[PDB]
Design a protein around this ligand. Structure first.
Ligand SMILES: *[C@@H]1O[C@H](CO)[C@@H](O)[C@H](O)[C@H]1NC(C)=O
Ligand SMILES: Cn1[nH]c(=O)cc1Nc1ccccc1
Length: 350
């Protein structure tokens, strides 16, 4: 089990001012896995108020359990986790509703705190006194909103460790189901909560959260256009840390924001979405992109079952490790399906 620790710096908070935190299982290993939880976001008073009543664990630590069980890539059992079962394991709950980008406290002017970027920094700082100072590799992983969080924060963790005097820790990122397209939608609605497209919702969110993006991406798109850096294919080329990208070609969250819930028009729309996603990954050398309609994530216990070209994700991640010690005989790291319809890969989740 992973044991809860609330942050000693109680000024770094969840949305409602309760302290943020992390769950830890030590492996007395020089590998550290820090995993970012997902769970959408909120971007104004009214839809944050709604989220506070029916998704409170995503806005508050007041009700968190004292322990959690690690699953999938967070499992310590080699049967379930062929990749990193003997690593030090950290699960960081998502309680900031800001795609891990915020840097704003609750105050007389702000009903909620949005501190996702500062939560990650404070977790890292507090872990350095519990053994992270001796690490050889720190893998910042995440699913869904947490996968986009990896892309927004992995270079900031690398910079933080460099400035604290730990240049020998290699920082890497693993972004699962956080690689979205700002594409044409299947049906169109002007921007309330359910009609607001991600580009418009994220533009408003950044202002509401005091959201922060990677500096080299911010310098490209400049003031008012930071929303671009929340889209993987736009932020990835600006990053210096090695990042492995896991993305379903037909991700259920992407289709939902595209107002898709089969005749010829919709068939062509779905096939073109798969082709577009494949295109954005052509020059991403470490990636795993199966042709499935899914919302399943890498902390699920049966994560080893899906294969691309006969290679599982735990194997691809191991080959990635070897590549960071020129391609490796029988140990591939770039695995993108080419077939054009959901479940044309037989290993897709059932
Ligand atoms: C607590 O965290 C805040 C936000 O990062 C920071 O400004 C402050 O210096 C921290 N306090 C201590 C004692 O580390
Ligand atoms: C928030 N979230 N939830 C997911 O499942 C994926 C994301 N990231 C995202 C990035 C840009 C635009 C829209 C969403």
């Amino acid at each position: 089990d992973l044991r809860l620790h609330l942050l000693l710096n109680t000024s770094v908070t969840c949305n409602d001012g309760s302290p943020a935190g992390y769950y830890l299982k030590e492996s007395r290993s020089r590998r550290w896995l820090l995993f970012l939880e997902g769970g959408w976001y909120c971007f104004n008073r009214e839809n944050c108020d709604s989220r506070y009543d029916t998704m409170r664990r995503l806005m508050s630590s007041r009700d968190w359990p004292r322990t959690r069980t690690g699953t999938g890539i967070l499992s310590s059992q080699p049967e379930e986790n062929p990749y990193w079962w003997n690593a030090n394991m950290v699960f960081i709950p998502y309680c900031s509703s800001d795609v891990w980008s915020g840097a704003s406290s609750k105050s007389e002017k702000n009903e909620y705190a949005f501190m996702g970027a500062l939560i990650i920094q404070e977790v890292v700082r507090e872990l350095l006194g519990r053994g992270l100072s001796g690490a050889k590799v720190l893998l910042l992983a995440g699913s869904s909103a947490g996968g986009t969080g990896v892309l927004l924060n992995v270079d900031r963790v690398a910079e933080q460790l460099e400035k604290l005097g730990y240049p020998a820790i290699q920082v890497r990122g693993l972004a699962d189901s956080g690689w979205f397209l700002d594409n044409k939608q299947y049906r169109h609605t002007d921007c309330d909560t359910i009609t607001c497209a991600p580009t418009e919702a994220i533009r408003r969110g950044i202002r509401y959260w005091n959201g922060v993006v990677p500096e080299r991406c911010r310098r490209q798109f400049q003031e008012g256009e930071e929303w671009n850096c929340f889209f993987g294919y736009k932020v990835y080329p600006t990053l210096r840390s090695p990042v492995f990208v896991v993305q379903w070609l037909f991700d259920e969250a992407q289709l939902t924001v595209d107002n898709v819930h089969v005749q010829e028009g919709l068939r062509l729309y779905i096939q073109n979405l798969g082709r577009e996603l494949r295109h954005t990954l052509k020059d991403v050398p470490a990636s795993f992109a199966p042709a499935c309609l899914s919302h399943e994530i890498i902390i699920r216990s049966h994560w080893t079952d899906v294969q691309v070209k006969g290679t599982s994700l735990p194997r691809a991640l191991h080959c990635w490790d070897r590549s960071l010690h020129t391609p490796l005989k029988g140990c591939p790291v770039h695995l993108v399906d080419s077939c054009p319809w959901p479940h044309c890969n037989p290993s897709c989740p059932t």
